[PDB]
Amino acid sequence: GSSGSSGEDYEKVPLPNSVFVNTTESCEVERLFKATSPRGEPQDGLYCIRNSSTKSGKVLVVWDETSNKVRNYRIFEKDSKFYLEGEVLFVSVGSMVEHYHTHVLPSHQSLLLRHPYGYTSGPSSG
């Protein structure tokens, strides 16, 4: 073609733009999850990062397959480290995610981050 610079390349990335949605409506997120799914049903652990009413704000939203609903986890910004509870922050989202992988998220019992939103996985693994 005449014009170039077309195509995104995000491999082996910690936080893919996929999870980052320009949708400030929790309700929408719930629909997307099931949408992006080829079986109209998201997988337990499906998490993402949407925006909030606030200016330049974000909120970690995870899919509670156990309850068949979505949660809300405000992502504050202190000392240049994203935190949800406070004293516990993370220089970068990536680290935070890895931390939760073993430390279930608050306001729940066994809600950990398995697979992000938008991103897709191969059947080989499973």
Query: Helix- and strand-based class?
Result: alpha+beta
- Tell me the name of the CATH homologous superfamily: SH2 domain
Overall shape: it is globular
CATH architecture grouping: 2-Layer Sandwich
The value of Rg in angstroms is: 15 Å
Could you give a short account of the major beta sheet? 4 strands, antiparallel
Q: How many strands in all?
A: 7
- Estimate the strand proportion: 15-25%
Q: Kindly report the CATH topology.
A: SHC Adaptor Protein
Function: Binds differentially to the SH3 domains of certain proteins of signal transduction pathways. Binds to phosphatidylinositols; linking the hemopoietic tyrosine kinase fes to the cytoplasmic membrane in a phosphorylation dependent mechanism.
Organism: Homo sapiens
Protein name: SH3 domain-binding protein 2
